[PDB]
């Protein structure tokens, strides 16, 4: 288990770590988070008490370095940093643990939620979507736009998700206009899976990362990408069986984790009704249809 120490907490803030969150008061003696499970990506996120417009955070993997958080009073945010002095870092962490100044990552042993939400998400792929090569961790916030959003404005601060556009030359073969528009299997299997993502694991990883950025940051472009990647599969008549069964599991845990009170802003009625009741895959997502009908029967 690894640790992300904090130098201090000079401003009152709600701190998120993966699906968990807790409130820190102004100048409270808070010095970080311990017992973070090794083997998964993680996200540590922030929403300032005095300005809820500040929602931002960092994706990281403790296997890639020793990371800490320090508040910057000039830029007004909690910043992730890497410590290259390993003995220094271990010395800091041990003092903070001995003084019990850290919250414990509060995972229940039965609970596979975080694994289920991040199964296909890799830090190397995160760092290609979020371009800032001098750091081993990745900053995301509520306001960052996607490459696609910017086509329709600072390039260095964009989310470089894979552009999906159903009415584009990439999606439609000349001579197969009706076929390719009504059955997107070509675009899914040849253009996206074989051509761009190379395999379904990379596709699912981007889909899972888009959902998590939508839910943890209220990022609108991420929500668009998540729905587009779902609709592309559901609108394809020919999808590998293992992919449909895995998609059903992925979506089930995403719908299960979504806060019931944010459902009105994170779920697109048209996409979900199309996917569950009209698409080629309307009868292939049994677990997702069941949780959706029992949890959010209004949206449908």
């Amino acid at each position: 288990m690894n640790t992300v120490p904090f130098t201090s907490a000079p401003i009152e803030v709600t701190i998120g770590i993966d699906q968990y969150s807790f409130n820190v008061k102004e100048n409270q003696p808070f010095h970080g988070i311990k017992d973070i499970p090794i083997g998964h990506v993680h996200v540590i996120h922030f929403q300032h008490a005095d300005n809820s417009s500040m929602r931002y955070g960092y994706w990281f993997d403790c296997r890639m370095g020793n990371f800490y958080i320090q508040y910057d009073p000039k830029d007004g945010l909690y910043k992730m940093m890497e410590e290259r002095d390993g003995a220094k870092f271990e010395n800091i962490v041990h003092n903070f643990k001995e003084r019990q100044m850290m919250v414990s990552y509060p995972k229940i042993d039965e609970d596979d939620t975080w694994y289920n939400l991040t199964e296909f998400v890799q830090m190397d792929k995160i760092r290609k979507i979020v371009r800032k090569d001098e750091n081993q961790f990745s900053y995301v916030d509520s306001s960052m736009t996607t490459v696609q959003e910017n086509e329709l404005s600072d390039p260095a601060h964009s989310l470089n998700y894979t552009v999906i556009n159903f009415k584009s030359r990439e999606a439609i073969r000349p001579g197969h206009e009706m076929e390719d528009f009504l059955d997107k299997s070509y675009y899914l299997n040849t253009v996206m899976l074989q051509g761009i993502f190379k395999n379904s694991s990379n596709y699912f990883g981007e889909l899972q990362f888009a959902f998590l950025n939508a839910m943890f940051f209220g990022n609108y472009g991420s929500s668009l990408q998540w729905h587009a990647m779902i609709e592309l599969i559901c609108s394809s008549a020919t999808v590998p069986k293992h992919m449909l069964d895995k998609l059903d599991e992925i979506l089930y845990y995403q719908i299960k984790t979504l806060p019931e009170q944010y459902s009105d802003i994170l779920l697109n009625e048209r996409v979900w009704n199309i996917c569950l009741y009209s698409s080629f895959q309307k009868n292939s997502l049994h677990n997702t249809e069941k949780i959706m009908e029992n949890k959010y029967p209004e949206l449908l």
Partner: protein, 253 residues
Amino acid sequence: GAMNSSNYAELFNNDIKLFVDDTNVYRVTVHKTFEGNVATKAINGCIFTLNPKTGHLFLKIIHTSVWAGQKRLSQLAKWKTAEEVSALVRSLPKEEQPKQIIVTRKAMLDPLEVHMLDFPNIAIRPTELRLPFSAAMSIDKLSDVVMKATEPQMVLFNIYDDWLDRISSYTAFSRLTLLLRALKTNEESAKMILLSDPTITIKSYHLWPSFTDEQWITIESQMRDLILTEYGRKYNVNISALTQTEIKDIILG
């Protein structure tokens, strides 16, 4: 965006545009089978593609062989329309290609957009006027060429005959809509109005009779009365009580 009454003059500006109507592409007769079931039999159709400024009518005849062995024909017909319109655009010199294509039915938007992806600068737009282009098959010469076709074929007509020598395209488009609306509402009566004087004929190279300016005024009045007379019959309305403002609103829209 969508084309409505707030911009009628855009129709007749110098930006090339075409209306596309697909209502006569897929045409059927419904009949009983020997076993007492119901079946359809397709008959030849057409795509109605019209330049409203010049009167050019590019009439693509849809022969029943295009439906052979195909499923979901009402859906296919929209994509076949879009395929044929795209092929027409590609067949035209650059300087004759439209800058906009206005579809009369919103279900044509996605099929046409997808077929026109190679032409990103050609706007595909819907419209809010209820235009009677379905009545194109009530024009005897167009119906004849469609029904006689034995294979796919494109035919050209000026739907305005020689009217633009004497009137503007706005008035010509207005005259065409009143004529077609009359033919759609009461085809028998409209044709009686148009053809009841033997001394006024249709030139071999025209679609409509060779009326003088004053005769067109009379014809147009008779078409309005027909539309008003059918309105009264349909809705059990006494048309005598109607004011001129009321009559204009009924015919318009």
